[PDB]
Each structure stands twice: as structure tokens, then as C-alpha cells.
Amino acid sequence: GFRKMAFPSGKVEGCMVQVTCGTTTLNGLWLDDVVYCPRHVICTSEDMLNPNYEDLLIRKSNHNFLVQAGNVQLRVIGHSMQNCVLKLKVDTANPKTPKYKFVRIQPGQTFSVLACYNGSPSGVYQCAMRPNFTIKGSFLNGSCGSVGFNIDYDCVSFCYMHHMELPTGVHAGTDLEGNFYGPFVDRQTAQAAGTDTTITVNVLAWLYAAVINGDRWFLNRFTTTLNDFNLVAMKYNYEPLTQDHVDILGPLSAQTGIAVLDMCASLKELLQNGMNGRTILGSALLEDEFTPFDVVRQCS
Amino acid sequence: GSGFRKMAFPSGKVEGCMVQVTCGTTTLNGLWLDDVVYCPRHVICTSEDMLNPNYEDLLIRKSNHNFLVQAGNVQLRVIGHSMQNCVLKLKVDTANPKTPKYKFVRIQPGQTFSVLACYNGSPSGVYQCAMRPNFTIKGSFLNGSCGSVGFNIDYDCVSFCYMHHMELPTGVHAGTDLEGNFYGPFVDRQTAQAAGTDTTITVNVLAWLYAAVINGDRWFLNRFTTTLNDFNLVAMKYNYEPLTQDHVDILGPLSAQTGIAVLDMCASLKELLQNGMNGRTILGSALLEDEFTPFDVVRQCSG
Numbered sequence: 001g002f003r004k005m006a007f008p009s010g011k012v013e014g015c016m017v018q019v020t021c022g023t024t025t026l027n028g029l030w031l032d033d034v035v036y037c038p039r040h041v042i043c044t045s046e047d048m049l050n051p052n053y054e055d056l057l058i059r060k061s062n063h064n065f066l067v068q069a070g071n072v073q074l075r076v077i078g079h080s081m082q083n084c085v086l087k088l089k090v091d092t093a094n095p096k097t098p099k100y101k102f103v104r105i106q107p108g109q110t111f112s113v114l115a116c117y118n119g120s121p122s123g124v125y126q127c128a129m130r131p132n133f134t135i136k137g138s139f140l141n142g143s144c145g146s147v148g149f150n151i152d153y154d155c156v157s158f159c160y161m162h163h164m165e166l167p168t169g170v171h172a173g174t175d176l177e178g179n180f181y182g183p184f185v186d187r188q189t190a191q192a193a194g195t196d197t198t199i200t201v202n203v204l205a206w207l208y209a210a211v212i213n214g215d216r217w218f219l220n221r222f223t224t225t226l227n228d229f230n231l232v233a234m235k236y237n238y239e240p241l242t243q244d245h246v247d248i249l250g251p252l253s254a255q256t257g258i259a260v261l262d263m264c265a266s267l268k269e270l271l272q273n274g275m276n277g278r279t280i281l282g283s284a285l286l287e288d289e290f291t292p293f294d295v296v297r298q299c300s
Numbered sequence: 301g302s303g304f305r306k307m308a309f310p311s312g313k314v315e316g317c318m319v320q321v322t323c324g325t326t327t328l329n330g331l332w333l334d335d336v337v338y339c340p341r342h343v344i345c346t347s348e349d350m351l352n353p354n355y356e357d358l359l360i361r362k363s364n365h366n367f368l369v370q371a372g373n374v375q376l377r378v379i380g381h382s383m384q385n386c387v388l389k390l391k392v393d394t395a396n397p398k399t400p401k402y403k404f405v406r407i408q409p410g411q412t413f414s415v416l417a418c419y420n421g422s423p424s425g426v427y428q429c430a431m432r433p434n435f436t437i438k439g440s441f442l443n444g445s446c447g448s449v450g451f452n453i454d455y456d457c458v459s460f461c462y463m464h465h466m467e468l469p470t471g472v473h474a475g476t477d478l479e480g481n482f483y484g485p486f487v488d489r490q491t492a493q494a495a496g497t498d499t500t501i502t503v504n505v506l507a508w509l510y511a512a513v514i515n516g517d518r519w520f521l522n523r524f525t526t527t528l529n530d531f532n533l534v535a536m537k538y539n540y541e542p543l544t545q546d547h548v549d550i551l552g553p554l555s556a557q558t559g560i561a562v563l564d565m566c567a568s569l570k571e572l573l574q575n576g577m578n579g580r581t582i583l584g585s586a587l588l589e590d591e592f593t594p595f596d597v598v599r600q601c602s603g
């Protein structure tokens with residue numbers, strides 16, 4: 001079988017806390033002696049339409065921030081703002097702090113989300129950064145400050161902090177330096193994203209995953225050039241495939257004995273002819289939120 | 301595009317219980333709770349024992365000092381051993397300080413749970429599985445994954461419901477509860493075993509229809525009702541599972557949230573089965589989903 005798999009979330013769970021300012025509560029990430037959270041925690045309903053964050057923050061004091069790790073209050077002893085993230089210095093270090101880094105991910109890359117409410121972890125699932133810099137998440141009221149991450153060996157690479165939902169039901173947020181992915185702004189307004197596209201390299205990775213699991217009805221005897229494939233891909237609002245993507249797909253190509261451009265010809269046929277009512281790995285749609293690495297990590 | 305997705309429970313409380321158990325060169329995963337480690341009993345088998353193992357005889361030949369239990373690289377001393385159905389229980393000299401509040405539960409077909417896939421006692425990934433009506437799961441398990449567990453978390457309490465033992469020829473997976481009783485008719489022997497023909501999980505399809513209604517997608521509701529028995533007889537003709545009383549009860553919260561009586565929703569589903577969807581969609585799809593339970597729907601709709 002082959003399904004969406006998230007990283008084990010324990011190393012991140014040990015970092016989640018609750019942050020309250022006024023009548024607003026959301027989550028924070030407690031690493032060493034600093035708690036990171038969305039800066040919109042400081043806004044009232046009046047502030048949120050056009051918040052002058054520097055002006056709002058200078059009017060706050062350390063004691064206006066209530067931070068709770070379970071049934072224990074952490075005293076804030078300083079604060080600062082970096083882009084759209086607030087950094088609350090506390091007087092206590094988190095002994096559960098994992099080895100970690102902050103990274104900014106590229107569109108098409110995947111990560112695990114630990115959805116949290118009131119500082120308590122509630123669910124974990126895999127997401128991709130969409131080409132239009134939204135994420136198709138599952139986030140409800142109170143989920144802000146939930147984070148996205150990848151794990152490599154013992155090191156947690158944090159790449160996402162949650163801030164908002166758009167009218168279409170997708171989500172937007174920042175890296176851990178507080179810079180948004182995409183053209184979004186932390187104000188209380190209805191915001192549209194640019195047109196999304198499908199992550200072609202990931203669809204191909206998943207077609208290879210299907211073949212590995214014995215699904216091969218969509219294969220064909222034909223091939224395509226890279227440029228001819230890309231012309232069709234663009235027509236169907238799929239991202240271009242680069243030579244780097246072809247290279248990245250090498251190990252899957254070698255495992256299955258199917259050249260990348262041969263799989264591209266299969267995908268072209270699927271775009272032009274549809275799935276004829278069949279499914280691939282149980283799905284009626286082409287899946288684009290597995291990277292080549294995700295397929296390899298899982299299949300071996 | 302439906303707004304719903306498979307969501308696992310946070311795995312940290314289970315990560316803190318995973319160990320490795322080795323007998324000879326065979327290593328699998330175990331679950332360390334208080335001063336007991338639970339694992340599949342086939343750890344005591346050699347390749348040759350596996351076709352027709354005599355587990356009672358194999359266990360009598362073992363002693364405490366034949367079991368290597370490790371949390372990471374740190375050995376945990378075994379002070380007793382016993383077999384309960386298809387699980388081995390190793391008493392150890394240290395109570396796991398990370399033991400959560402826990403219970404052992406035996407789930408019903410249709411129920412979902414989170415799997416923490418582990419190798420050599422180290423977790424690799426977490427994902428949601430549904431117990432199919434034929435008592436198999438569609439996991440992602442490789443060599444070395446045995447002893448990985450399935451669980452749900454309710455408030456503080458981890459309910460362990462699955463321990464992994466084997467892969468069937470069709471690529472689906474079989475295992476036990478934490479008392480070592482297999483789900484389904486399967487046995488822990490390296491023989492060819494077949495799953496029964498699978499069926500659609502009706503209670504979960506009904507949960508999905510309720511989810512659609514909650515989201516304002518309700519074209520399929522009709523003015524009619526059915527008895528439970530009439531519905532079940534029709535359902536079987538479409539390879540859908542019959543509903544049990546427990547299924548009716550677990551749909552209670554969604555029925556109350558929407559005001560649509562369970563048997564009225566059954567009549568709507570019956571019409572969909574008999575007439576098809578006629579080019580229409582529900583929650584964006586022409587296919588009905590059967591791996592979200594009523595609990596999963598409430599979690600994703602209401603938090």
C-alpha cells in the first residue's frame with residue numbers, strides 16, 4: 001500500500017504551549033527560552049482590519065502575555081517581533097527542545113502539520129506548499145501557531161506557522177522568521193490567492209509509486225520530449241518539469257525500469273483522456289502531494 | 301478538495317513506548333507500558349519455524365536471557381516471560397517513565413485508528429487506517445514493521461487497538477489486539493491466507509453524507525424513510541455492509557446535529573445505490589468515502 005504518512009510528532013508536541021493576550025488565545029512554539037507565535041494575538045476585533053503592529057506592540061507589557069505549558073504558567077520576561085511572528089522570552093528553558101532548524105520551503109515540497117488548539121496537539125497530517133503558496137490544510141478557530149515541519153535524523157526542520165484561512169477554505173501562514181508564503185497579509189480581510197497549478201514532479205512520483213504497488217493500467221508504449229510534455233502540462237495548469245526534476249526522479253525510474261519521459265507520456269495521456277472511470281492507488285484524481293523523496297522514504 | 305483528509309492522532313505518547321525486541325537475529329518492535337513489553341510472539345521463530353510453528357514448544361525452549369529488549373541502544377533486562385494468544389509479554393525490571401494513561405480496546409470493523417509505523421524500535425511515520433469489514437487494514441508496512449501499533453487518543457488516554465503481524469498476498473495487512481487475538485480469521489504462520497471479499501463500510505458512508513449536509517451539500521436528501529432491515533437487505537445487494545444497532549447509535553450525534561434521522565439518511569443512501577449519482581457530486585466527488593467514521597467527521601467539522 002501507499003498512503004499519506006506524516007512524521008512522528010512527539011518532538012514537536014513537547015514544544016507546544018498556549019499563548020493568550022486579552023481575549024485571544026492561540027498556540028506558541030517553545031524552543032529553549034523563547035516562545036514563537038503569530039503576532040496577531042495582540043489584535044482586538046477593532047485592530048484586526050488594519051493593525052499597525054509596531055504601534056500595537058509597543059503598548060503591550062510582558063504581563064499582558066499569558067503563556068501556559070500544560071497546567072504551568074511561564075513568565076514572560078521580554079518580547080520582540082520579527083516580521084509576522086512574536087518572540088516571547090520566558091524565564092524557563094524547555095528541556096524537551098529538540099535539535100532543530102528554521103527553514104523556508106519551496107512550492108511543491110511537503111511537510112507535516114501538527115494541528116493544535118489551546119496549546120494541546122490534536123492531529124497530524126501531511127501537506128504540500130502549493131505553487132500559489134497556500135496550503136490545503138485542516139485548521140479551525142484557535143489553530144493559529146500550529147506548525148509544519150520535517151524530520152531528518154534527530155533534527156526537526158520547522159517550515160510553517162499557521163495564521164489564516166482564505167474564503168476558498170485553503171490556508172496561509174509564515175515561515176518561522178515570520179515571512180508569509182505568498183501574497184497574504186495578517187489582517188482580517190478576505191484574501192484570494194493566485195491561480196493554483198498542479199505539482200507535476202509529484203504526480204509523476206506518485207505514478208511511480210502506483211507502478212511499484214502493481215497499478216500499471218495507465219502506462220503506454222510511447223514517449224515524449226521534455227518540451228512537448230511541458231507544452232501540454234502548461235495547457236492543463238500543471239507546473240513545468242525541469243531537468244532537475246527528471247534527475248530527482250532517477251531512482252524511481254531505475255527502480256521500475258520506466259524512463260521519466262516514458263512516464264511523462266503516460267501522464268500526458270491521462271491529462272488528455274481522463275481516467276476513464278478507473279482509479280490509481282484508490283484515487284479518482286491525480287495526486288500531487290507526494291514528493292519523489294516521500295515515495296522513496298516510504299517504499300524503502 | 302472535499303475539505304476532509306485523513307488525520308492521525310499526535311504520536312508522541314506512543315513514541316515514548318516503542319522498543320525493539322530481538323531473539324537471535326530477528327528484531328521487531330515492542331510496546332513498553334509500566335513494567336511489561338508486548339510484542340508479536342513470532343519473534344521467537346526462526347525462518348524454518350514460521351510455516352508451522354509450535355509456539356508452546358518454542359516458548360518452553362526460551363529463557364529470559366534469550367530476549368534482547370532495547371530502548372534505543374539501552375538494554376532493558378527481562379525478568380519474566382509469558383504468552384497470551386499471539387502476543388508475548390516480557391516482564392522487565394524498569395517501569396517505563398513515559399507510560400501514558402492507557403487501555404487496551406478491541407475495535408469493530410469500520411473504526412479508524414492511527415498507526416505509528418516503526419522499524420528497530422524507531423518510529424518512521426504516522427497515518428490513519430480503517431479496519432475493513434474483512435478484518436484487514438490497508439497499511440504501509442515493510443519488513444521489520446511487526447509490533448508497530450494502532451491507537452486512538454481520548455483526552456489523556458491512549459486506547460491501543462492494533463499490533464501488526466503480517467501481510468496477506470493481496471498486499472493488505474493483518475494483526476491482533478493487544479491481548480493477542482487476531483482480528484479476523486488469520487493465524488500467525490507463514491502460510492498463504494486469503495482475506496474475505498471486502499465490502500463498503502456503510503456506517504462511514506452515512507457519516508460522509510452527514511458531513512456533506514453539514515457543509516450545505518444536501519441534494520440527495522429525500523422525503524422518505526426505511527426500516528433498518530429493508531435497508532440492510534438492499535445494502536447487501538450493492539456489497540455494502542449491513543448496519544448494526546451500534547452503528548445506528550454512533551450516528552446519533554450527527555443525526556442530532558443535522559436533524560436528519562438515521563433511517564431517513566439510510567433511505568437517501570438507498571436511493572443513491574439504486575439510482576447512482578447521475579453526473580452529480582457530493583463534497584466534490586462522484587465517489588462516496590467510507591474511511592471517515594462519525595467521530596472523524598465531527599472532529600473535522602466541529603473540532
Ligand SMILES: *[C@H](O)[C@H](C[C@@H]1CCNC1=O)NC(=O)[C@H](CC(C)C)NC(=O)OC[C@@H]1CCC(=O)N1C[C@H]1C[C@@H]2CC[C@H]1C2
Nearest residue numbers: 139140141142143144163164165166167186187188189190
Ligand atoms: C487563528 O487561530 C485563525 C485561524 C483560522 C480560523 C479559521 N480557520 C483558520 O485557519 N486566524 C484568523 O482568525 C485570521 C486572523 C487575521 C489574519 C488577523 N483570520 C482568518 O483566518 O479569517 C478567516 C475568515 C474565514 C474565511 C475568511 O475569508 N475569513 C476572513 C474574514 C474577514 C472578512 C469578514 C469575515 C471573513 C471575511
Ligand SMILES: *[C@H](O)[C@H](C[C@@H]1CCNC1=O)NC(=O)[C@H](CC(C)C)NC(=O)OC[C@@H]1CCC(=O)N1C[C@H]1C[C@@H]2CC[C@H]1C2
Nearest residue numbers: 342441442443444445446465466467468469488489490491
Ligand atoms: C513482521 O515484521 C512482518 C511484517 C511483514 C513483512 C512484509 N510486510 C509486512 O507487513 N511479518 C512477517 O514476516 C510475517 C511472519 C509470519 C506471520 C510468521 N509474514 C509475512 O508477513 O509474510 C508476508 C509475505 C510477503 C507477502 C506474502 O504473501 N507473504 C506470505 C508468504 C507465505 C508463503 C511464502 C511466500 C508467501 C506465501
